[PDB]
């Protein structure tokens, strides 16, 4: 798994575009509790397939938030995966 950019001792779980940062859950809380300005940052779950990119699609059938590339790889695999309905997370 991609490491947290601040603590570099835990797997990242969220991605913050404004900070351009992959963060584990505790570092995410510490960074955005710092003040009201930071607390407005919108964050997204890190892809649960590759765990190295921000997720862009939620697939409830797979119970997985996936980045664009993992979403395409997983759902082109075969005709059952191809019918999965995903929710754009934007
Ligand atoms: Zn961390
Ligand atoms: Zn942020
Ligand atoms: Zn991915
Ligand atoms: Zn799926």
Salient structural properties:
Zinc finger protein CONSTANS-LIKE 2; 4 helices; three-stranded antiparallel beta sheet; 90 residues; alpha+beta; monomer
Can you characterise this structure?
The chain is of the alpha+beta class. The chain has two domains: 1-46; 47-90. It is built from four helices and six strands. The chain has helices spanning 25-32, 36-39, 68-75, 79-82; strands at 14-16, 21-23, 43-45, 57-59, 64-66, 86-88. The strands form two sheets. The protein has a three-stranded antiparallel sheet. Strands 5-4-6 form a three-stranded antiparallel sheet. Strand 4 (57-59) and strand 5 (64-66) form a beta hairpin. The structure holds zinc ion (4 copies). Residues 4, 6-7, 10, 23-24, 27 line the site of one zinc ion. It is classed as plant protein. The entry lists the keywords B-Box, COL2, plant protein. The assembly is monomeric.
Shape: elongated
The span between the termini is: 24 Å
* Number of helical stretches of at least 4 residues: 4
Bound ligands? zinc ion
Structural class by helix and strand composition? alpha+beta
Q: DSSP strand (E) fraction?
A: 15-25%
Whole-number radius of gyration?
A: 14 Å
PDB class: plant protein
Keywords: B-Box, COL2, Photoperiod, plant protein
Assembly: monomeric
Entry title: Crystal strcuture of the tandem B-Box domains of COL2
């Amino acid at each position: 798994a991609r490491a947290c950019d601040t603590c570099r001792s835990a797997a990242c779980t969220v991605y913050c575009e404004a900070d351009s940062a992959y963060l584990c859950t505790t570092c995410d809380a510490r960074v955005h509790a710092a003040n009201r300005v930071a607390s407005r940052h919108e964050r997204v779950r890190v892809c649960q397939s590759c765990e190295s990119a921000p997720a862009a699609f939620l697939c409830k059938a797979d119970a997985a938030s996936l980045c664009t590339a993992c979403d395409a790889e997983i759902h082109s695999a075969n005709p059952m995966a191809r019918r999965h309905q995903r929710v754009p997370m934007m």
